[PDB]
A paper describes a structure:
The plant-type carotene desaturation system is mechanistically linked to redox chains in which quinones, the alternative oxidase PTOX and molecular oxygen participate. This is contrasted by the phytoene desaturases of the [name]-type prevailing in archaea, bacteria and fungi which are capable of catalyzing the entire desaturation sequence including one cis-to-trans isomerization reaction at the central double bond. For the conversion of colorless 15-cis-phytoene into red-colored all-trans-lycopene [name] thus takes over the function of at least four enzymes employed by cyanobacteria and plants. The observation that highly purified [name] [name]-His6 from [name] very efficiently converts 15-cis-phytoene into all-trans-lycopene in the presence of FAD and in the absence of any other cofactors or metals speaks for FAD being the sole redox catalyst involved. Since in [name]-mediated desaturation in vitro redox equivalents are transferred from phytoene via FAD to oxygen the system behaves formally as an oxidase.
Native, enzymatically active [name] was crystallized in the space group P3221 with one monomer in the asymmetric unit. The structure of apo-[name] was solved at 3.0 Å by multiple anomalous dispersion using selenomethionine derivatives. The model was further refined against a 2.35 Å resolution native data set to an R-factor of 19.1% and an R-free of 22.9%. The structure of apo-[name] is composed of 19 β-strands (forming 5 sheets), 12 alpha-helices, and three 310-helices. Altogether these fold into three pseudo-domains consistent with the flavin containing amino oxidoreductase family (Pfam: PF01593) as revealed by structural search comparisons (see the topology diagram and structural alignment in Figure S3 and Figure 10, respectively). The first, the FAD binding domain is composed of a five-stranded, parallel sheet sandwiched between a three-stranded anti-parallel sheet and a five-helix bundle. The ligand binding domain is composed of a seven-stranded mixed topology sheet with two alpha-helices packed onto the top surface and two, two-stranded anti-parallel sheets and two 310-helices packed onto one edge of the bottom surface of the sheet. The third domain packs against the rest of the bottom surface of sheet 4 and is composed of a six-helix bundle. The final model showed several disordered regions, and of the 492 [name] residues only 404 are visible in the electron density map. No density could be seen for residues 34–40, 138–139, 195–196, 275–302, 331–343, 426–455, 465–470. Structural analyses revealed that most of the disordered regions (i.e. 34–40, 275–302, 426–455, 465–470) are involved in the predicted FAD binding site and therefore order-to-disorder transition should occur upon FAD binding and membrane binding (see above).
Numbering used by the authors: 1 to 33, 41 to 137, 140 to 194, 197 to 275, 303 to 330, 344 to 425, 456 to 464, 471 to 492
Amino acid sequence: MKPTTVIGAGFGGLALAIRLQAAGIPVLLLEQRYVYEDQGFTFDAGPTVITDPSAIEELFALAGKQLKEYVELLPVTPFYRLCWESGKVFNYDNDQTRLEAQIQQFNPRDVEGYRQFLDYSRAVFKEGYLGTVPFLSFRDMLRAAPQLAKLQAWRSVYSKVASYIEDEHLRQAFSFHSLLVGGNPTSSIYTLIHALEREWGVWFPRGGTGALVQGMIKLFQDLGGEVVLNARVSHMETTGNKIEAVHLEDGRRFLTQAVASNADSNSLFVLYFGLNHHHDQLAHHTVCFGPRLAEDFSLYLHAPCVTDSSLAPEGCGSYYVLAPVPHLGTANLDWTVEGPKLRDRIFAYLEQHYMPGLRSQLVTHRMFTPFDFRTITNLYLVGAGIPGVIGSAKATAGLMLEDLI
Ligand SMILES: [Cl-]
């Protein structure tokens, strides 16, 4: 049988290839060339937030395997930390005792205000309401961050929290969490409350994103699939309304039954950096608030070494920071000059407020500015973070299997 070709498509393409291969279809997975490594430091900005691994576990169950045999998921505690430039901190988790102890520190009166807020909200959603595990997208929150407090979803949730909670930092903390677990900055408080109706946590794969990719590739190969590396697609070869073969830039030609591939608000500035010191005082996920309450979401810091020390050399740290920037073309910016300047301003800010001796500890770093981000019968388009990408591959697999079998 001619193999079925899956062209890149990240976690979606990898999940699709696994489901086709598990079903008896010979697959060729083409990787063009999400995780970068330099001087012993491992850098991934590929969404690390795992709250619901069930869609991943479901792929491994198809081969009669378990995810744990290939990938170890590490619990992240707290889920994240909210940091105000003023020095105030709020550690988010699902433990009412640890939440109340923090609320007590901001405003004693707000512990009862919080309990009353939960009692009222539970009563509203007691009947006729179901659900889905909350998914944390710091990127999506940050891409809407300048206009965060401006939004109708924020205003509505803020006024609902404000009816019970008097403290400004606490009104901001709960409103932020509601919009974060909601996924789409939805005026209804159900999302904030539903989060607690279920036992959920934050997980991180040992080795990060790269180890999850590698475990899925190993699963794919154990099922009999083949991986083509440095596969730069030049064009498709056609006969009638069908693709006969996939052609690569290097001259390789692969005969195929079917082809599956990917489709073909503020911007974000990414800054990866490696330090020769492990900042053990940081949370894995940090949401930084700054002025222009008179403070809003300004930086996201990912410090995965507090959970996984394998991401950097011994006594070192691997980090990334996201900063919201105007959309490319929108502010007539020269990212060749603006990028190094923003990088240096970010370093100074993080050192001043959260990471002492940052600059003197720098080993390596890299920026990704908005500039850097620049009929057929047997052709299929592949397509909530990683589990959401993986789950969308399930529908493509079903459709492809019906046409192949
Ligand atoms: Cl611009």
